[PDB]
Amino acid sequence: EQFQHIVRLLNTNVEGKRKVPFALRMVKGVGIRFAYMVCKKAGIDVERRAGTLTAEELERISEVIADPAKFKIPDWFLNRQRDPKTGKTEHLTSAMVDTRLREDLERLRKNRVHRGVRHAYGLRVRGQHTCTSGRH
Amino acid sequence: RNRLPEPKLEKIGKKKVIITNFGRICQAFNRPIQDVKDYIEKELSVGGNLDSNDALILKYEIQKSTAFD
Amino acid sequence: KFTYRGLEIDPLLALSEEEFKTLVHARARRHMNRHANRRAPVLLKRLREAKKDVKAGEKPRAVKTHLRDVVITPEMVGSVVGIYNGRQFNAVEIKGEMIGHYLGEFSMTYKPVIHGRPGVGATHSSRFIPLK
RNA sequence: AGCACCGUGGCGCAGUGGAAGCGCGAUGGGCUCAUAACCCAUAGGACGUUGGAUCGAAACCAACCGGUGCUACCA
RNA sequence: UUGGGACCGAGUAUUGCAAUUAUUGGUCGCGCAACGAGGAAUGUCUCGUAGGCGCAGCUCAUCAAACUGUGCCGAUUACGUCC
């Protein structure tokens, strides 16, 4: 009966798009993560976002994003593998995309390695060319 | 016998005369911008403006000289 | 403080060559394997020499080298190394967070540019820009 | 000292109640072997200030302020 | 927007005597960075052509949005004038 409209999955608002993975993109989150729907204990596709906390319940999904080493264990599939301040991590956020990122930045800034110099000025830090593009 | 910056010129397009030193000159005898400009442009009876990077422009054409003085 | 992989200084030092190159990134591993046969014959020695001799409460005497194609291992940490940008030996001391890098990265090889007004030929339209 | 007129984009001005425009400019392009000449795109407005009239205005009324002209010449 | 990706972080393997100013691949996250048919003006084209699409050779440890060559899918209009 009742349809969705501005659901949450992080205390962050999420559109009621009528295919399930494409809603979760908002949570960051992208398509070639989600397709673990098999192991996420709602196997649904071709099914609305609105059917949440019924018997295709919400916290099923949520838990499998929090700790993916008991719903199956591959890496090459995780944002941060082999952290360089802890031994290993899984890492699937927000909220920590704008924290963990920022910390890497700060680390380089300090001891002044080349990647960190170039990024303080806002210049390109990879391969890259300038003087024709990008121009602001 | 005072010292006044020696106005210095350019011949652009063989019509116009741009005067680079305009801003500096106006400062020296302690008078403003627009008012000084008016007098000049009236006598010669030409158009042109100032604006820019405070270099004057005039539609008056002369053989390049120090005779602007 | 510093954690390389959740390891303080003493664990890192304790590791043998095998256990070390396992722990580090892909480049570093690739490097070590390919090399063998010395390939930093002097750059080890010179450091460990002046390192040892110190009475502490201050850094080792500085050593100079041109080379920058050599890793940073936990052995050489605490030393003071020169690195050569093509006219200046540059001062760097080696922190515990410089492990898993090279030398050259800390030594700039150009002055960053900051400009100073564009001259004529910049702007296509013509005014013959006074005075710079 | 009054009377008259005027105050709108950097500058000169248009706009008699449905309420931001034009000519010269500045800046950047295009036309041209180059320059004039000539097109185009950009940014740039307390519509002098205050009150009042009016469903509603920058436009009408009053008060003050500034600018210019005319007449005044101050025991 | 699941249209487009530009930027950006982490892990890994190969090439090489040496890849740090990421060289090249290959999977995760970043997409909430642009951009919604484009002003004045301007380029070269008449049939297997225009346009769309892919492959090889070239350079050469490594890397081609380039150049040279070959193939596939395959039209509209005019066949005139001197402004």
Side-chain angles (χ1 to χ4, degrees), chain A residues 36-55:
Chain A
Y36 285 136
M37 289 294 165
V38 188
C39 305
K40 281 184 169 186
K41 308 178 298 302
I44 58 183
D45 288 297
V46 195
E47 210 288 301
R48 62 192 193 279
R49 178 53 71 237
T52 43
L53 196 59
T54 305

Side-chain angles (χ1 to χ4, degrees), chain C residues 46-108:
Chain C
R46 302 294 174 279
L47 297 177
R48 297 180 296 176
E49 183 182 1
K51 184 65 179 299
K52 184 178 181 296
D53 297 345
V54 80
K55 59 182 180 64
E58 64 291 305
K59 283 73 174 180
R61 183 182 58 81
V63 171
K64 295 189 295 178
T65 191
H66 283 355
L67 303 175
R68 50 166 59 177
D69 57 290
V70 180
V71 215
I72 297 178
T73 54
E75 187 178 62
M76 61 173 76
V77 173
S79 300
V80 178
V81 176
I83 311 88
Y84 185 63
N85 59 11
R87 51 164 178 172
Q88 288 174 9
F89 299 96
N90 295 108
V92 174
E93 193 272 352
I94 299 184
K95 300 292 180 64
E97 296 184 358
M98 296 195 178
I99 304 173
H101 291 276
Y102 287 84
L103 296 165
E105 306 180 5
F106 296 100
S107 183
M108 294 289 288

Side-chain angles (χ1 to χ4, degrees), chain B residues 23-37:
Chain B
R24 183 58 186 164
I25 293 165
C26 298
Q27 296 181 305
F29 46 79
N30 306 295
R31 286 293 178 275
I33 302 300
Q34 299 296 105
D35 295 298
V36 180
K37 188 188 71 61

